[PDB]
Amino acid sequence: SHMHLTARGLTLDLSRPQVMGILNNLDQALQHAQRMLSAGATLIDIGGELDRVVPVVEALAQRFDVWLSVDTSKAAVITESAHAGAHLINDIRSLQEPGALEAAAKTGLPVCLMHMQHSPYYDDLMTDINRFFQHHIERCVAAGIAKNKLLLDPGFGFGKNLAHNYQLLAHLSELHHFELPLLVGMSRKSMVGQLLNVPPQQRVIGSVACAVIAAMQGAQIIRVHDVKETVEAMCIVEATRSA
Template sequence: MLRLGKREFAAHQPVIMAIVNRTPDSFYDRGATFGERAALERVARAVDEGADIIDVGGVKAGPGEEVDAAEEIRRTAGFVAEVRRRHPDVVISVDTWRHEVGEAACAAGADLLNDAWGGVDPRLAEVAARYRVGLVCTHAGGAEPRTRPHRVRYDDVMADILRVTVGLAERAVALGVPREGVLIDPGHDFGKSTRHSLEATRRLPEMTETGWPVLVSLSNKDFVGETLDLPVRERLLGTLATTAVSAWLGARVYRVHEVEETRQVLRMVAAIAGHGVPAVARRGLA
């Protein structure tokens, strides 16, 4: 059972996490939801389209303008409180690697801390434990936050992913993070080449076999762009193909920009796998 905030998700229930960037320089939307009004409209639309989790980020993942903890808190904490007021039942996640930001976010009503940088600040898990909220444990290959991989090598990329993510998950539970709120993430693009991310995708069953629910953050990423030689705004089909494969291989949570398109893909895969039923069934019956 996966339990986050007020929500419980059954074993075969796919979970959509909608990205809401409170940054002026995000790689995908170029600051479209930096303003609070636009960001709140994005949240409402994502919830209407079927998002289960809203993931709020205050710092661009890649290199860019320096954003200290105080500014990251300014961009996220008050917004989390307003989202909680408007959408009391939605799961709210905050994408941060800093314990100070996690503290402010949890105090404002966050249900999940999405640590995309592999536990670089070990105190973030302590915050999650103290507030009894969920935690995403990600493999980033030891990379420093907001850096790009350079000539990175692994003897076995999935072995390293398992060592790091399972280790972080076990530490989190030992600290007091609720076990049913801990997820592991292979960290596509983070500390990886495109070939590493492709291998991590096809070897996802090795992650699901650990028993920890697996989150995948695939949306419009560089490994999709390099595979297809396409710019950011033309990566939707590649993203959805990777989403379908990941769903078939057992991923549970999908961090995305396009909620409705992802929802349709996940419903289709679930129906083929026998975990869902058609919305209507008329063909051949009349």
């Protein structure tokens, strides 16, 4: 592909699967970030709010060359994080909070929209996901955020039971029809843990096998705890797909 994102004068090449590392004391964070970079992550996702999140963005921005992603729903945090050097806004609530869509538009930053839905239930999961994204992509565009700024995250684990998460992983290539990059996060989740019955630090192998499946279907960005293992797996996936 020529799929890519643009932020802060930089290009992120999504021609091959990129690993996003998860970052959740200040100095421990920066040592963890450096380790994820050396392991080969090209993005670091910072999760919280303003006083926890913003300084680590500032700190990361000063010291590293790597894309910074901030997961927030708060208009304030979106705004400040932009000033601090964030490249990407990842919102679980798809900019539905008051002022969130406006603040995001203003920044000009790429925005990740995430599907989410009490026991979860769908008449047809893929139909609902599509309808949800068609709707919210229109809402972003109407707000001035260009279609080329958007990423879609089908939200594994979010209002989805075990059978749903695996159905969505089996049909994941279907979301390419939007012509936008897919970001997926399955790392150490219950969808792995409920199948293996192990604690989270023992879900590394299952999480990597989910990452491999998703990458084989063209997912552009993989968000994970265990960067170095997921990077090595993605080299195996890249070599098969180039054969």
